[PDB]
Amino acid sequence: TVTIKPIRAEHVESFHRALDAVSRERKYLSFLEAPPLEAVRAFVLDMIENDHPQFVAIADGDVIGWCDIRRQDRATRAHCGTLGMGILPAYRNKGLGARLMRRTLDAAHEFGLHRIELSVHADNARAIALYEKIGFAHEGRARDAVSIDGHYIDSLNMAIIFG
Amino acid sequence: DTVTIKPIRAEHVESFHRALDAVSRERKYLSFLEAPPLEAVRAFVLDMIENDHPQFVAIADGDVIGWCDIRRQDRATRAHCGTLGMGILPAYRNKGLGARLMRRTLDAAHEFGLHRIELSVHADNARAIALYEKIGFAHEGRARDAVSIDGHYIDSLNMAIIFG
Ligand SMILES: *O[C@@H](C(=O)NCCC(=O)NCCSC(C)=O)C(C)(C)COP(=O)(O)OP(=O)(O)OC[C@H]1O[C@@H](n2cnc3c(N)ncnc32)[C@H](O)[C@@H]1OP(=O)(O)O
Ligand SMILES: CC(=O)SCCNC(=O)CCNC(=O)[C@H](O)C(C)(C)COP(=O)(O)OP(=O)(O)OC[C@H]1O[C@@H](n2cnc3c(N)ncnc32)[C@H](O)[C@@H]1OP(=O)(O)O
Q: Looking at residue A86, which CATH number applies to its domain? A: 3.40.630.30
Q: Is B47 exposed, middle or buried (0-12, 13-18, 19+ CB in 10 A)?
A: exposed
Q: Rounded to an integer, what distance in angstroms lies between the CA atom of residue B82 and that of residue B107?
A: 13
Range of B26's domain? 1-164
Q: How many domains does chain B have?
A: 1
Q: Rounded to an integer, what distance in angstroms lies between the CA atom of residue A150 and that of residue B77?
A: 10
Q: Rounded to an integer, what distance in angstroms lies between the CA atom of residue A146 and that of residue B73?
A: 11
What are residue A156's DSSP bridge partners?
A: A120, A141
Q: Rounded to an integer, what distance in angstroms lies between the CA atom of residue B164 and that of residue B150?
A: 40
User: With an 8 Å Cβ cutoff, is B31 touching chain A?
Assistant: yes
> If DSSP codes are grouped into helix, strand and coil, which group holds residue B16?
helix
Half-sphere exposure of A127 (CA within 13 A, CB side): 21
- Distance of CA B98 from the midpoint of ligand 1 (Å): 7
∠ CA B6-B11-B13, nearest 5°, is 90
Q: Is B69 exposed, middle or buried (0-12, 13-18, 19+ CB in 10 A)?
A: buried
- Are B116 and A75 an interchain contact pair (Cβ–Cβ within 8 Å)? no
Rg of chain A over CA atoms, in angstroms?
15
- Element spanning A140, H or E: strand A137-147
User: Residues for chain A: how many in total?
Assistant: 163
Beta strands B81-88 and A62-71, pairing class? unpaired
User: With an 8 Å Cβ cutoff, is B26 touching chain A?
Assistant: no
Half-sphere exposure of B38 (CA within 13 A, CB side): 7
| Residue of A31, A115, A142 lying closest to B145 (CB–CB) | A115
Resolution (A): 2.2
